[PDB]
Design an enzyme around this catalytic site. Structure first.
Site, PDB file in Angstrom:
ATOM      1  N   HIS A   3      17.955 -29.110  47.421  1.00 59.34           N
ATOM      2  CA  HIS A   3      17.822 -28.790  46.254  1.00 59.34           C
ATOM      3  C   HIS A   3      18.591 -30.631  45.598  1.00 59.34           C
ATOM      4  O   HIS A   3      19.546 -30.464  43.980  1.00 59.34           O
ATOM      5  CB  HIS A   3      18.722 -27.453  45.417  1.00 59.34           C
ATOM      6  CG  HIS A   3      19.592 -27.319  46.094  1.00 59.34           C
ATOM      7  ND1 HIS A   3      21.056 -27.513  45.830  1.00 59.34           N
ATOM      8  CD2 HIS A   3      19.552 -26.957  47.101  1.00 59.34           C
ATOM      9  CE1 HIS A   3      22.137 -26.333  46.654  1.00 59.34           C
ATOM     10  NE2 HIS A   3      21.085 -25.992  47.506  1.00 59.34           N
ATOM     11  N   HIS A  22      27.986 -33.407  44.051  1.00 58.48           N
ATOM     12  CA  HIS A  22      27.139 -33.283  44.673  1.00 58.48           C
ATOM     13  C   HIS A  22      26.316 -34.170  43.003  1.00 58.48           C
ATOM     14  O   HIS A  22      27.455 -34.224  41.962  1.00 58.48           O
ATOM     15  CB  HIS A  22      26.391 -32.573  44.566  1.00 58.48           C
ATOM     16  CG  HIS A  22      26.285 -31.148  43.571  1.00 58.48           C
ATOM     17  ND1 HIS A  22      26.823 -29.555  44.048  1.00 58.48           N
ATOM     18  CD2 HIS A  22      25.590 -30.910  42.409  1.00 58.48           C
ATOM     19  CE1 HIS A  22      27.143 -29.063  42.809  1.00 58.48           C
ATOM     20  NE2 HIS A  22      26.384 -29.496  42.238  1.00 58.48           N
ATOM     21  N   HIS A  57      23.097 -34.242  39.953  1.00 56.16           N
ATOM     22  CA  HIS A  57      21.209 -33.498  39.709  1.00 56.16           C
ATOM     23  C   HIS A  57      20.997 -35.349  38.405  1.00 56.16           C
ATOM     24  O   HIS A  57      21.564 -35.692  37.929  1.00 56.16           O
ATOM     25  CB  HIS A  57      21.957 -32.448  38.374  1.00 56.16           C
ATOM     26  CG  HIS A  57      22.319 -31.425  38.613  1.00 56.16           C
ATOM     27  ND1 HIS A  57      21.625 -30.296  39.301  1.00 56.16           N
ATOM     28  CD2 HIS A  57      23.851 -31.279  39.188  1.00 56.16           C
ATOM     29  CE1 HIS A  57      22.446 -29.608  39.760  1.00 56.16           C
ATOM     30  NE2 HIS A  57      23.955 -29.994  39.779  1.00 56.16           N
ATOM     31  N   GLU A 104      22.189 -32.325  32.727  1.00 61.42           N
ATOM     32  CA  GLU A 104      22.400 -30.752  33.398  1.00 61.42           C
ATOM     33  C   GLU A 104      23.126 -30.300  32.179  1.00 61.42           C
ATOM     34  O   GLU A 104      22.178 -30.059  30.487  1.00 61.42           O
ATOM     35  CB  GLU A 104      23.508 -29.724  34.242  1.00 61.42           C
ATOM     36  CG  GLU A 104      22.152 -29.906  35.483  1.00 61.42           C
ATOM     37  CD  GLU A 104      22.764 -28.938  36.400  1.00 61.42           C
ATOM     38  OE1 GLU A 104      23.647 -28.650  36.664  1.00 61.42           O
ATOM     39  OE2 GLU A 104      21.343 -28.553  37.087  1.00 61.42           O
ATOM     40  N   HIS A 116      28.863 -33.388  39.774  1.00 60.93           N
ATOM     41  CA  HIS A 116      30.438 -32.255  39.259  1.00 60.93           C
ATOM     42  C   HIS A 116      30.500 -32.590  41.110  1.00 60.93           C
ATOM     43  O   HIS A 116      30.252 -32.016  41.983  1.00 60.93           O
ATOM     44  CB  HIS A 116      28.745 -31.051  39.698  1.00 60.93           C
ATOM     45  CG  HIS A 116      27.667 -30.609  38.762  1.00 60.93           C
ATOM     46  ND1 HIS A 116      26.953 -29.647  38.470  1.00 60.93           N
ATOM     47  CD2 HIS A 116      28.364 -31.306  37.828  1.00 60.93           C
ATOM     48  CE1 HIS A 116      26.629 -30.270  37.022  1.00 60.93           C
ATOM     49  NE2 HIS A 116      27.496 -30.476  36.566  1.00 60.93           N
ATOM     50  N   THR A 170      25.371 -23.751  38.147  1.00 60.21           N
ATOM     51  CA  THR A 170      23.970 -24.349  37.705  1.00 60.21           C
ATOM     52  C   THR A 170      22.305 -23.439  38.411  1.00 60.21           C
ATOM     53  O   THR A 170      21.591 -24.251  37.937  1.00 60.21           O
ATOM     54  CB  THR A 170      23.651 -25.519  37.065  1.00 60.21           C
ATOM     55  OG1 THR A 170      23.317 -26.287  37.643  1.00 60.21           O
ATOM     56  CG2 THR A 170      25.084 -25.518  35.894  1.00 60.21           C
ATOM     57  N   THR A 171      23.079 -23.493  39.983  1.00 62.53           N
ATOM     58  CA  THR A 171      21.748 -23.159  40.863  1.00 62.53           C
ATOM     59  C   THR A 171      22.328 -21.688  40.740  1.00 62.53           C
ATOM     60  O   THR A 171      23.110 -20.983  40.918  1.00 62.53           O
ATOM     61  CB  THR A 171      21.857 -24.121  41.781  1.00 62.53           C
ATOM     62  OG1 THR A 171      22.931 -24.081  43.005  1.00 62.53           O
ATOM     63  CG2 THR A 171      21.215 -25.313  41.190  1.00 62.53           C
TER      64      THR A 171
HETATM   65  N1  LIG Z   1      25.729 -27.389  40.146  1.00 68.44           N
HETATM   66  S1  LIG Z   1      27.056 -26.386  39.859  1.00 68.44           S
HETATM   67  O1  LIG Z   1      27.500 -25.493  38.967  1.00 68.44           O
HETATM   68  O2  LIG Z   1      28.163 -28.006  40.360  1.00 68.44           O
HETATM   69  C1  LIG Z   1      27.003 -24.956  42.379  1.00 68.44           C
HETATM   70  C2  LIG Z   1      27.633 -25.809  42.464  1.00 68.44           C
HETATM   71  C3  LIG Z   1      28.594 -24.899  43.795  1.00 68.44           C
HETATM   72  C4  LIG Z   1      27.305 -24.157  43.978  1.00 68.44           C
HETATM   73  C5  LIG Z   1      28.048 -22.749  45.488  1.00 68.44           C
HETATM   74  C6  LIG Z   1      28.377 -22.011  45.454  1.00 68.44           C
HETATM   75  C7  LIG Z   1      28.714 -21.090  46.843  1.00 68.44           C
HETATM   76  C8  LIG Z   1      27.730 -21.248  47.100  1.00 68.44           C
HETATM   77  C9  LIG Z   1      26.767 -21.239  46.744  1.00 68.44           C
HETATM   78  C10 LIG Z   1      25.249 -20.718  47.019  1.00 68.44           C
HETATM   79  O3  LIG Z   1      24.748 -19.584  47.969  1.00 68.44           O
HETATM   80  C11 LIG Z   1      26.569 -22.702  45.719  1.00 68.44           C
HETATM   81  C12 LIG Z   1      26.011 -23.755  43.385  1.00 68.44           C
HETATM   82  C13 LIG Z   1      26.240 -24.123  42.191  1.00 68.44           C
HETATM   83 ZN   LIG Z   2      25.610 -29.065  40.253  1.00 71.64          ZN
END
Ligand SMILES: NS(=O)(=O)c1ccc(-c2cccc(C=O)c2)cc1
Ligand SMILES: [Zn+2]
Length: 257
Positions: free
Chosen positions: A61, A91, A93, A103, A116, A195-196
């Site tokens: 992703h 990471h 987007h 986003e 992020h 956001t995921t």
């Molecule tokens: N894109 S974001 O809002 O910065 C974001 C940051 C951290 C995660 C996250 C954290 C812990 C576990 C998982 C998946 O199971 C996802 C998922 C999304």
């Molecule tokens: Zn993110």
């Protein structure tokens, strides 16, 4: 599984993750004229001097750089936050073209990409526990626009060919995330979500007003990544962003006049 395509993208996520239609979902549009300056917001503290990066990873992703979060090495404090938040990973987007990819939006403007930096509240002991709390995570969001190169990004860009497809990782030690920050720490803040998936409502969002500039060559390298695993039909990792969600009963606060 979930993704960003027509049949598994953001409009489908609510079927597996009903909180997708919740009361504090992210991202949002930041209406700059409606955000209110809050003179009580304490100064933001980004302490990354002792950061220890570990690996860089294509997770299907995005790509992420992971850090040692077993001690208070790289932490975020202050601003709207109570307590200490450890950096776990960063990471991005991004889009298929420079006019989309972020986003969050600012007065409906989309940036080419969004960084992020993901931190978790040490009072909950581990990130898994933190994701179950309304103040468990703090994500520092930084917009990317295309123009001049960002030198502090180049070391990331140059290893992406080694993690083209989902499942690949590489050593990525001694990376200094301070090289990804703009000059100003002026910010907007609001309560939101991942956001995921799982879209958990556990995030204090801190979105910097000043974007960083990256070069066209740098963002082109993001766009050569693949959503697919090796051996599967090639689908470029582009447009891995969730669109703005309803603000509902929230106010966005500004740290600056
Ligand atoms: N894109 S974001 O809002 O910065 C974001 C940051 C951290 C995660 C996250 C954290 C812990 C576990 C998982 C998946 O199971 C996802 C998922 C999304
Ligand atoms: Zn993110």
């Amino acid at each position: 599984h979930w993704g960003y395509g027509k049949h598994n993208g953001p409009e489908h996520w609510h079927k597996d993750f009903p909180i997708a239609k919740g009361e504090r979902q992210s991202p949002v549009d930041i209406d700059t004229h409606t955000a209110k300056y809050d003179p009580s917001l304490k100064p933001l503290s980004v302490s990354y001097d002792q950061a220890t990066s570990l690996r860089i990873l294509n997770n299907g992703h995005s790509f992420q750089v992971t850090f040692d979060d077993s001690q208070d090495k790289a932490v975020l404090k202050g601003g709207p936050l109570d307590g200490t938040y450890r950096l776990l990973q960063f990471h991005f987007h991004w889009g298929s073209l420079d006019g989309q990819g972020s986003e969050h939006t600012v007065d409906k403007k989309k940036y080419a990409a969004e960084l992020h930096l993901v931190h978790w509240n040490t009072k909950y002991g581990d990130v898994g526990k933190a994701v179950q709390q309304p103040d468990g995570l703090a994500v520092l969001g930084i917009f990317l626009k295309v123009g001049s190169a960002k030198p502090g990004l180049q070391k990331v860009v140059d290893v992406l060919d080694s993690i083209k497809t989902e499942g690949k990782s590489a050593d990525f030690t001694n990376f200094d995330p301070r090289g990804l920050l703009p000059e100003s720490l002026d910010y907007w803040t609001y309560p939101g979500s991942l956001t995921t998936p799982p879209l958990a409502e556990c995030v204090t969002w801190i979105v910097l007003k000043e974007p960083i500039s990256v070069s066209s060559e740098q963002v082109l390298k993001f766009r050569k990544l693949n959503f697919n695993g090796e051996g599967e039909p090639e689908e470029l990792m582009v447009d891995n962003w969730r669109p703005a969600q309803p603000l509902k009963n929230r106010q966005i606060k500004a740290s600056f006049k």
